[PDB]
Design a protein around this ligand. Structure first.
Ligand SMILES: O=P(O)(O)OC[C@H]1O[C@H](OP(=O)(O)OP(=O)(O)O)[C@H](O)[C@@H]1O
Ligand SMILES: O=P(O)(O)OC[C@H]1O[C@H](OP(=O)(O)OP(=O)(O)O)[C@H](O)[C@@H]1O
Ligand SMILES: [Mg+2]
Ligand SMILES: [Mg+2]
Lengths: 178, 176
């Protein structure tokens, strides 16, 4: 697919970052090339509409790199975007959830009024690795009694089996790397 | 301006967050109401086109809340968006710049821009101007020309606009 090629050709892979042995998939060039960014958002939007029709109520974007994609994706679908943030950043009543990140623990947080019970959400982030981040997002959304229809990303690192961590919540990525 | 009203009426104010005495201006409802978000992006884009014509090469979005506006504004203008991040997140050779927040640092890849390229920086909120000022420093060290900085919200009592001078600044909404 030519649209997909526009995205794939703008991922830049850095070896041994942030640790020896790991390859970092840099999405910066996708952002920098407006045709590449437009293609990425279009491909995600087409998958979501083809899969869920009118069922999606909101997109949820994940702090921080997921913020690059959430609002544009929401806009393309005619939807609003809600935020899930690293803990400590949101005012008002919140819920939070730990997850393992690198060698330690981090927490995500959501405003308690971000969604109402029964609302249907799709979560977007730039990249799925271990799945810890996306899994925490799903936990939070579940605790608001929201229904997570699907999680999506630009990049998926398939050897880390993040998709399995999210099951039974469906997952879709544009691009896959070991 | 009813477009501007679509944005203003979706700012939510929280006293004493994160510290007693201040009022936090929460942009979350702007992002949640697609009409409000579209209005904000449209007002910013119209201002920038009216001020710079075709001279803007790139938008630079500031980690993290500025990431919510950078790509959409860039797309509206037909431009790419470059990233300025909190230090420690970017691969490859980088430059960084400290500012008072304790201390924090922003960072940019050395190859983010070429000398002479013209940039507009976007963030959600201008307060002291420390974050925006650090971004301008970084872009200047790449020999990029910062045409303007913009935000949705400006806290005027903190005099951030003056901190950035002579770089022009524009905000949609102003609060003390
Ligand atoms: O699937 P996982 O193993 O949880 O990793 C994926 C997450 O890691 C990165 O975020 P990071 O915490 O590095 O922060 P950033 O979004 O600020 O870059 C990335 O943006 C994803 O959110
Ligand atoms: O003008 P200043 O006094 O520098 O304050 C403005 C900055 O503060 C907030 O960012 P914050 O560092 O709180 O991080 P966030 O973007 O992750 O919310 C806001 O998003 C601006 O970037
Ligand atoms: Mg992330
Ligand atoms: Mg910020």
């Amino acid at each position: 697919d030519s649209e997909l090629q526009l995205v794939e050709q703008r991922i830049r892979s850095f070896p041994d970052f942030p640790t020896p042995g790991v390859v970092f998939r840099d999405i910066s060039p996708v952002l920098k090339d407006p045709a590449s960014f437009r293609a990425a958002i279009g491909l995600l939007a087409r998958h979501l509409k083809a899969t869920h029709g009118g069922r999606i109520d909101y997109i949820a974007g994940l702090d921080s790199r997921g913020f690059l994609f959430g609002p544009s994706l929401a806009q393309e679908l005619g939807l609003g975007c809600v935020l899930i943030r690293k803990r400590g950043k949101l005012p008002g009543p919140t819920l939070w959830a730990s997850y393992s990140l690198e060698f330690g623990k981090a927490e995500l947080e959501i405003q308690k009024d971000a969604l109402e019970p029964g609302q249907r959400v799709v979560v977007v982030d730039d990249l799925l690795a271990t799945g810890g981040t996306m899994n925490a997002a799903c936990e939070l959304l579940g605790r608001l009694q929201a229904e997570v229809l699907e999680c999506v990303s630009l990049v998926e690192l398939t050897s880390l089996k993040g998709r399995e961590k999210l099951a039974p919540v469906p997952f879709f990525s544009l691009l896959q790397y070991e």
